[PDB]
Design an enzyme around this catalytic site. Structure first.
Site, short mmCIF file in Angstrom:
data_model
loop_
_atom_site.label_atom_id
_atom_site.label_comp_id
_atom_site.label_asym_id
_atom_site.label_seq_id
_atom_site.Cartn_x
_atom_site.Cartn_y
_atom_site.Cartn_z
N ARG A 82 0.82 -1.21 0.00
CA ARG A 82 0.00 0.00 0.00
C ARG A 82 0.86 1.26 0.00
NH1 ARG A 82 -0.18 3.07 3.93
NH2 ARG A 82 1.17 2.59 5.72
N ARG A 89 8.00 2.04 2.93
CA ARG A 89 7.54 1.24 1.80
C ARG A 89 6.89 -0.03 2.31
NH1 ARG A 89 8.37 4.75 -2.47
NH2 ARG A 89 7.90 2.91 -3.76
N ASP A 92 8.24 -3.21 -2.29
CA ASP A 92 8.78 -2.84 -3.58
C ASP A 92 9.42 -4.05 -4.24
OD1 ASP A 92 8.14 -0.08 -3.17
OD2 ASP A 92 9.89 0.05 -1.86
N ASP A 94 11.79 -4.69 -7.62
CA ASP A 94 12.59 -4.09 -8.69
C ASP A 94 13.19 -5.18 -9.55
OD1 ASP A 94 12.98 -0.97 -8.09
OD2 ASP A 94 13.10 -2.01 -6.16
C1 LIG Z 1 12.97 4.62 0.23
C2 LIG Z 1 14.10 3.82 -0.41
C3 LIG Z 1 14.90 4.76 -1.20
N1 LIG Z 1 14.99 3.44 0.70
C4 LIG Z 1 15.33 2.13 0.89
N2 LIG Z 1 16.25 1.90 1.90
C5 LIG Z 1 16.56 0.61 2.07
N3 LIG Z 1 17.46 0.28 3.05
N4 LIG Z 1 16.04 -0.44 1.35
C6 LIG Z 1 15.09 -0.23 0.30
O1 LIG Z 1 14.70 -1.23 -0.27
C7 LIG Z 1 14.75 1.15 0.10
N5 LIG Z 1 13.83 1.40 -0.90
C8 LIG Z 1 13.64 2.64 -1.23
C9 LIG Z 1 12.61 2.84 -2.31
O2 LIG Z 1 12.14 3.97 -2.51
N6 LIG Z 1 12.22 1.77 -3.05
C10 LIG Z 1 11.73 1.96 -4.37
C11 LIG Z 1 12.46 1.06 -5.43
N7 LIG Z 1 11.87 0.88 -6.65
C12 LIG Z 1 10.58 0.37 -6.57
C13 LIG Z 1 10.13 -0.02 -7.92
C14 LIG Z 1 10.10 1.09 -8.95
S1 LIG Z 1 8.58 2.19 -8.81
C15 LIG Z 1 8.51 3.58 -10.02
C16 LIG Z 1 8.65 3.28 -11.48
O3 LIG Z 1 9.79 2.57 -11.82
C17 LIG Z 1 9.58 2.02 -13.11
N8 LIG Z 1 10.67 1.12 -13.37
C18 LIG Z 1 11.73 1.40 -14.28
N9 LIG Z 1 12.64 0.43 -14.33
C19 LIG Z 1 12.19 -0.52 -13.40
C20 LIG Z 1 12.69 -1.74 -12.99
N10 LIG Z 1 13.86 -2.27 -13.50
N11 LIG Z 1 12.04 -2.49 -12.05
C21 LIG Z 1 10.90 -1.96 -11.55
N12 LIG Z 1 10.29 -0.79 -11.86
C22 LIG Z 1 10.98 -0.09 -12.80
C23 LIG Z 1 8.14 1.47 -13.13
O4 LIG Z 1 7.57 1.79 -14.39
C24 LIG Z 1 7.49 2.37 -11.99
O5 LIG Z 1 6.44 3.12 -12.46
C25 LIG Z 1 11.33 1.98 -8.83
C26 LIG Z 1 11.80 2.19 -7.37
C27 LIG Z 1 13.20 2.81 -7.51
O6 LIG Z 1 14.14 1.98 -7.58
O7 LIG Z 1 13.29 4.04 -7.52
#
Ligand SMILES: CC1(C)Nc2nc(N)[nH]c(=O)c2N=C1C(=O)NCCN1CC[C@@H](SC[C@H]2O[C@@H](n3cnc4c(N)ncnc43)[C@H](O)[C@@H]2O)C[C@@H]1C(=O)O
Length: 155
Positions: A82, A89, A92, A94
């Protein structure tokens, strides 16, 4: 194709969420999990005022096209999670790597656009794929060596 998927959640008790996501990933059509990294407790990237993250890496065998895989990861995120920019988060997913493919579309950038900067993505991946080579010839081992990212604590 072997796709490598990063999982993240910083629910206060995220184990059930991560396990549900892991089961969902294995239930994706034409796909199955080959290996899962250990679970790691990582300090939040972004504000310090939120719980630690559980991060892990998954090797997923799949015959799906890469944009089809993204459709499933995005579906799982909607069904299991959500909610913002710097957390917290719910869940997520990736796509870090998709075989040896390079993808630059509006929806999808593979290799993941920022994984090179994120120890919480690189170290779980190095556990399950220490010899990994990126499509451009970069080596996962070398990125970790060059950047000297702090090693991670297990969950
Ligand atoms: C808060 C923060 C920084 N702090 C953390 N701190 C620790 N310790 N540990 C963490 O895990 C951690 N996580 C963090 C966090 O914010 N997490 C978000 C990581 N992800 C989630 C999936 C995608 S969502 C947006 C668009 O991305 C596009 N998109 C383009 N390419 C790809 C791809 N290859 N795979 C998936 N989506 C993709 C889609 O089209 C989507 O619309 C991108 C986003 C990112 O990486 O920015």
């Amino acid at each position: 194709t072997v796709a490598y998927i990063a999982i993240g959640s910083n629910l206060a008790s995220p184990l059930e969420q991560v396990n549900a996501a892991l089961k969902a990933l294995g239930d994706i059509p034409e796909s199955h999990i080959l290996t899962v990294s250990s679970f790691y407790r990582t300090p939040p990237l972004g504000p310090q005022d939120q719980p630690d993250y559980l991060n892990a890496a998954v090797a997923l065998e799949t015959s799906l096209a890469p944009e089809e895989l993204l459709n499933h990861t995005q579906r799982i995120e909607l069904q299991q999670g959500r909610v913002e920019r710097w957390g917290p988060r719910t869940l997520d997913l990736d796509i870090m790597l998709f075989g040896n493919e390079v993808i630059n579309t509006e929806r999808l950038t593979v290799p993941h656009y920022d994984m090179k900067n994120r120890g919480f993505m690189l170290w779980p991946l190095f556990e399950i794929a220490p010899e990994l080579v990126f499509p451009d010839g970069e080596m996962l081992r070398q990125i970790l060596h060059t950047r000297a990212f702090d090693k991670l604590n297990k969950w």
